C-alpha cells in the first residue's frame, strides 16, 4: 500500500493500481520460477498482454497505438513490474524505454511506421546494443565495424550484454563506421537489425547472479547486410542518438530499484509481526523497528526524488545531473534495503524458498550492469565542472 | 541556485528569492559573529523586520496579521534562514512553529487576540518549554509541579533546554498538575507564562557546541502564580496539546538540515573550482567528483522528501510516520554532508574563519537536539506495529 | 599473498602454506561445482584426507589422534578452507569445532574413546543440533522432548538448521528434559546420537542462497531410544555444555568471513590490472583505488582483531564480549567487501561463471546463520551492563 | 580499564599504567580549559615532566637521553596523551615523532647532540614544517626559495599549518633549494631553524574547530640566514627525508584517534548506567546496547590493527600501504565513535561542559590534518598497481 504523499494524480494512481492488479495474477506467482529456470516461457504472451494495456508504448505517440503519456507513468509501470519481478522489469525497460523511445525520437517516417506499430502492441520484442566484451562503460570504444559497400552496409563484429537479445525482433546496434575519426565518438552509427537477416546470430543466454529470466546474450554479425534505410539518424553521428536519451533512460531505469525496495518491504513488514521470539513479535524489538524505519525512509526518499525528477522532465526542464543522481541514489539504496530484508528474515531469508535473496541478487544489477555508480558520480561531477 | 524540480509555484519561488535576498543583505554577513559571541544583538530588530516581511506568521490566520499560507512556505522560510544562519533558524522555528502554531490550534480567542498579534509582528518573542533536566525524551516525566489555589496555579520547579527563554516574552510551559494520575500522560497542563510574572526567572544561557546564538537557558519557577486564564487547552490535558502538532513540528524543523546542506554546498562547489592541487582544479579529481555527487544527491533526495510530505500535510493528509521519517533522514544526511564539506575544504575547513565547522556543529543538534534519532526511529517502527 | 603482520609463528605459517597448497588442488578447483550442484561428491574422501593432514582434531588431544594445538591454528585452517570454498569451511567449522571440541570438553572417558578417534581421523562426520524450526535465536525455546523410560530416553521432536546433518555419523542434540523448570534453561540436556539409531531420520537438504554444498537438513526424531551413557555432560545441565564453548565457537567461526574477504580480494586485485577502460587499466582510476584501499583495510583490521582474540583465548584470558565482537565485525565487513568486489568486476561480476557472486551469497550466512548481528550486539551490551 | 588482548608485554602494561596515572593528575583535569582558552599555560613544565618520565624520546637511542624502545611503546604514549587531551596529544606527536625520529634517522653526530639531548628532556619543543598556505597535499609543490650564498642559505617565503610553531625552539622546515629540477621532487632540502634566528617569524595562532591548545601558526622567512651545517640530510634531496618520515609518521599518529575513542568510551559507558529514562538505565535499551557494542568493536579492531602493524615494524617489516591504512581506518572510525558518543549523551553532549563535543571536534583533524583520507586511500591504491 502506497501513499498520496508521492503527489500522483488520479489517472496515475488508477494506472498504478491496475498494473498492480494485473501483475499480482499474471507475473507475481511466476517470479520464483522465472528466476529458478532462468527463462520466462510466457514472455511472448505476457508482452502481448502488456501491449493491450497500453503500457508498452506508454510514451510513444498515439499515432502508432501508444498512450502519449509522460515519463512519470513509465516510471510507475517500471516500478510495478519490478515489484512483481526484476527480470521482467528490466526486460520491459529494455524494450519500451531503450528501443521504442529511441525510435520515436530519431526514427524517420518509414521506420516509425514499420517498427513501432508491432513494437507497441507486443508482436515484436526490442533490444538495444551499445556494449561489447571490452566496451561496457567506454561505449565509444566499440569494435563492431560497418563498411558501406554501395547502397548497403556490411557489418562484422560482436555485441555483448544485450537484454532480450535471443527474443528481440528489432534491435538497435551501434557500429563503428569509421575508425579514423578525429574523435572516436564521430565514427559510430546506429543500425536497425531485424530477426532473420542473413549473417546475424545470437549466442547462448547468460547465467547471471540475479534478474534471471531476462535473456541476455551476444550478437554475432558475420557479413551482415543492412540496407541504407535501416540507419537510425545519420551516418557517423551515432553518438548523437546514443546520448540524446541517456538522461531520460537513466530516469526510467530508477523505477526498478524502487519496485525492488517496495517488494522487500512488502515481505519484511508482515513477516516481522508474525514471527515471534522470547514471547513477543520480533517486529517489536528496537533493533528491528529501527531497521524497518531506515528501510521505509530510504524507500520513500528515493521514490520522491525519482518522481519529482520525472515530473520535471515531463514539463520541459530535464537535465542529466538529476537523471543520473536519482539512479545513483536508488540503485545504491536498494542493495542496502535488500540486505536489511534478509537480515530481518534471518535463516528463512537465506533459503531460496523465500524471495529475500532474489531481491538482493536483482538490486545489484542496476549498479554494475545498467550503468555503474562510478560513471553516474562522474557525470554529476563533470556537470558541476561545466558551470 | 536552486532548481525548479521540487515542484514550487511561482509565488513560492518569489518568496524564496525575497527571503534569500533579505538574508544575504541582513542576516548572512553576521552569521559568523552570532556564533562567535553566542548572541544575536540585533535579535529584536531582525524579528521586527521578519514580521514586516510577513514570515513570522507564515502559517497563522490573517485575522492576527499573519500570511495564512501553507506549511511548504514555512519549510522554505526555515530552510532559507538556516542557510543564512542555523542558530537564527532554530530561534525562528522555536518562535513561529513551536509557539505561534501552538496558539492557533489550542488557544481560545482571548489568548489569541492578546499574544498572536505581537508575536507575528515581531514585538514579542516566543518559546516552548516541554523538556526538563531529567526528562529529555520521557517528556511525560516532568518535575515542574503546578498546584491549583482558587482561580490561580502555584507553579514550582525548573525547565531545561528552552530556546529563546532569555528573550521570550510569551512562553508555553508544561507543568504537572495531577500528581495521582495512573497514566502520567493526563497529569500535565500547559501554561502561558509571560516575562515579568513574579516568581519566574531565567538562568544563564548555555554554551553549546553549535547553534551558538539561539539563546537556550533554564527557567526557574518559585511560587509562580499563574492566572486560570493563562492555561493552554484544558487542565490535566496537557499531552493532547503537546502531541496535537508534533508531526507538523518535526516537518517544519526538517528545513534546518536542508538549509545547512545547501549552505555547505554553496561553499564547497565554488571552492572546489578555485582551489588547485597537482596542477589542476581539485574539483576535477574523481574522488572529489564522487563526494560532490553524493552530497548533492543526498540534499536533493531530502529536499524532495520533505517538500512532498509538506505538500501532503497542506492537503488534509498528514501522517506522523512520514513527518518523523523526513526529520530523521534530513538530520542524518545533514551531518553526513557537513562531514564531507569539511573534507572538501582541506585544512581551511578546520579553521573558524570558514563556515564549514559551524554547519556540522549546528546539524548535530537536529540529530541529538529538538528530538533524538532513536525516538523517531521507534516512532516509525511503532507506526507499523499498530497495523 | 597474505602478510606476516598478524604475528604468526613459523609453524603457523607452515600450516597456512600447507593448507593453501592442499586446497588449491583438492578443493579450490571444485568450488564452482559444489555451489552449482549443492553437493560435495567427494565429501567423505576429502574428509579422510583432511584428517590425515591432522586438522580435523587440530584442537583435540593427541591421545585420541588430535594435534594438541591452540585455537589460532583452528582459525587459520577455517580461513584457509573458506578461502577456497565457504560451504566446506562451514562444514569444517561444524564438525571440527561444534562437535569434537564439545566432546573433549564435556565428554567422558567412554564417550571420548568411542567417537573422537573416528571423528578426528575422518571416518565419522559430526554435527551439532540446538536450532529448531521456530527457535533460531531463542536457544532455550526448543521443542524436542526426551522422556526417561527407565535406563533409556525416548526422544520425540525435530531439529532444524543442522550442518552436515545428512552426512553426520555422530550428532550432539539438545532436548528438553523437564517442561516444568522455573527457568527453561534448567530443563535441557545434551545427547550423543549415532546414525542408524532406531527412530531417527533426516529430511531433504535445504536449497540455500549461499554455502551451497554444506548439507543442511532437518533431524526427525520419532520415539528414538537413546541409552543413558550417551548423555553429554549431566542430565538437566544442557545449557552449561551449550554455553561452555559458545565464546570459542564464535571465535573460531570468525575465520570464514576472513577467508571470503581474502578470496574476493585475490580475485579482484588481479582483475583490476588486466581489464582496461578508456585506454588505461581500470585499477588506475581513483574510485577503484579507494575501493581497493577500503577492502584491504577492512580485511586487515578484521584479521588482526580475530587473530589477537584467538591468541588471547589460548593463554587463559578469554571473554564472550570479544569473541562476539570479532565475529560481528568480521561478518558485517565481509558482506560489504564482497559487494564492493562485485562492484569492481562490472558485468563480469554478475555472471555465475565468476566467483564474485558466490562470495557475496556465502558471506551473508555469518550475519544471519550461526548467529545474528543483533544477538552479538546485545551480548556485548549486556556484558557492558554487568560491569 | 584496558583489556590485555592486544598482546602487550608486562613492561608495556606498566608503561600504560604510569602514563594514565600521570595524565589523570597533570593533564586530564585541564583539558577543558586548554580547549576553551585555546592555549596550554603549563606547556613547558608539562613537557619537562614528560622528559623526566622518559616518554619524549621513547623511540630514540639511550645515548642522547632516549629510552631505546619500539614504535608500540610510542603509540601507547600517544594514545594515552590523546585520551586526556587531543590537542596536547597532537603536540606530543609533532614534537616526539616529527622532530626527534627525523633527527635520529637523518641527523649527523653534530646535529644529534646540539638539539636532541634537550628535545628529549623537554627544554626544547619540536616542530616540522612541510605544509604551506598553497600546498597541503601536493607537498612537492612547495614555494619557499632557498638561495645558497656561500657558507649559508638565505630562505624567503611562507609556510602554514605548523604545530608547536609559536613555541617550538627547533623546527625541521623544508625549502626549495632548486626550483628548476626536471622532477620537482629533487629540488627540495630540509633545514633546522632555531627560534631566535633573524628573519624567521611566527604568525598569530590559528582559531581551529578542534585541537584547541596545540598552537599552530604560519612560518614567515624574510631573508633568513641558516648555516650550511643545519642541513637535514643533503642538498636537493629533501623529498627523501619527507618520504622517510612518512610510514612511521602515519603509524604513530594512529594512537590519537585510538585515545579519543577510548576517552569517549570512558565517558559513555559509565554515563549510560547512571542516566535513567522511561524508568530504566539507558544502558539497558537495545539501541544503546548496539551503539556501545559497535563502538567497542570498532575501537578494539583499530587497536589490534595499529598494534600489530607497530609490532611488525619493530622487527623489520614495515610497509607504506599498511601504515597508511592503519590511520585511514582509525581516524575514520574515531569520528563515527565520537558522533555515537554524543548521540548517547544526548542533550548533555551538546553543551561545552561535557567532553563529547571536544572529542568530536578533535577526531576530525586526523581526517583532514596530518594527511587526508583521499591521500591515504590513493597511496594504498598506488601500492597495488606496482605488483
Ligand atoms: C540494453 C543493455 C542491457 C544490458 N543488460 C545487462 C545485464 O542484464 N547485466 C549486465 O551485467 N550488463 C548488462 N549490460 C551491460 C552493462 O551496461 C555493462 O556491463 C556496464 O556498463 C559495465 O560493464 P563492464 O564490465 O564492461 O564495465 P567495466 O568498465 O569493465 O567496469 C570495471 C569497473 O571500473 C569502473 N570504471 C570504469 N571506468 C571507470 C572510470 N573511467 N573511472 C572510474 N571507474 C571506472 C566501473 O564502474 C566498474 O566498477 C547491458 C547493456 C545494454 C546496452
Ligand atoms: C523549544 C525547545 C527547545 C530545545 N532546545 C534545545 C537546544 O537548543 N539544545 C539542546 O541540546 N536541547 C534542546 N531541547 C531538549 C531536547 O529535546 C533534548 O535534549 C533531547 O530530547 C534529548 O533529551 P536528554 O538531553 O534528556 O537526553 P536523554 O533522552 O536522557 O538521552 C538518553 C539517550 O538515550 C536515548 N533513548 C532515550 N529513550 C530511549 C529508548 N526508549 N530506547 C532507546 N534509546 C533511548 C536517547 O535517544 C539518547 O540517545 C529543547 C526542547 C524544547 C521543547
Ligand atoms: C550447528 C548449527 C548450524 C546451523 N547452520 C545453519 C546454516 O547452514 N544455514 C542457515 O541458514 N542456518 C543455520 N543455523 C540456524 C541459525 O543459527 C539461525 O537461523 C539463527 O540463529 C537465527 O535465525 P532464525 O530465523 O532461526 O531466528 P529468528 O528469530 O526468526 O530471526 C529473525 C531476526 O530477528 C532477530 N531477533 C530475534 N530476537 C531478537 C532480539 N531479542 N533483539 C533483536 N533482534 C532479534 C534475529 O536476530 C534475526 O535477525 C544453524 C544452527 C546451528 C545450531
Ligand atoms: C607540524 C605540522 C602540523 C600540522 N597541523 C595541522 C593541523 O592543525 N591541521 C591540519 O588540517 N593539518 C595539519 N597538518 C597537515 C596539513 O596542514 C594538512 O595536510 C592540510 O590539510 C593541508 O592540506 P590542504 O587543506 O591545504 O589541501 P587542499 O588541496 O587545500 O585540500 C583540497 C581537498 O581535496 C582533496 N584532494 C587534494 N588533492 C586531491 C587529489 N589529487 N585527489 C583527490 N582528492 C584530492 C584533499 O585532501 C582536500 O580534502 C600539519 C602538518 C605538520 C607537519
Residue numbers in the entry:
A (entry chain B), B (entry chain C), C (entry chain A), D (entry chain D): 6 to 392
What do the authors of the reporting publication say about this deposited model?
Consistent with other ACADs, including short-, medium-, and long-chain ACADs, IVD is characterized by a tetrameric architecture composed of 4 identical subunits. Dysfunction of IVD is linked to isovaleric acidemia (IVA), a rare metabolic disorder characterized by the accumulation of toxic metabolites.
During purification, the protein sample exhibited a conspicuous yellow color, indicative of its interaction with FAD, a cofactor that accepts electrons and stabilizes the conformation of IVD. Thus, the original structure of IVD was resolved in the form of only combining with FAD molecules, achieving a resolution of 2.55 Å. To enhance protein stability for cryo-EM analysis, additional FAD was incorporated into the sample buffer. The base of the binding pocket, where the isoalloxazine ring of FAD resides, is predominantly composed of hydrophobic amino acids, while the opening toward the neighboring monomer accommodates the adenosine portion. The cryo-EM structure reveals that each FAD molecule is coordinated by residues from 2 adjacent monomers within the IVD tetramer. Other residues including R312, G384, T409, and E411, which interact with the ribose and pyrophosphate group, arise from bordering monomers as well. This inter-subunit binding mode implies that FAD not only participates in catalysis but also bridges monomers to facilitate tetramer assembly. Therefore, the binding of FAD also plays a critical role in stabilizing the protein structure, as validated by the modifications to the buffer system, where its addition reduced the protein’s propensity for precipitation.
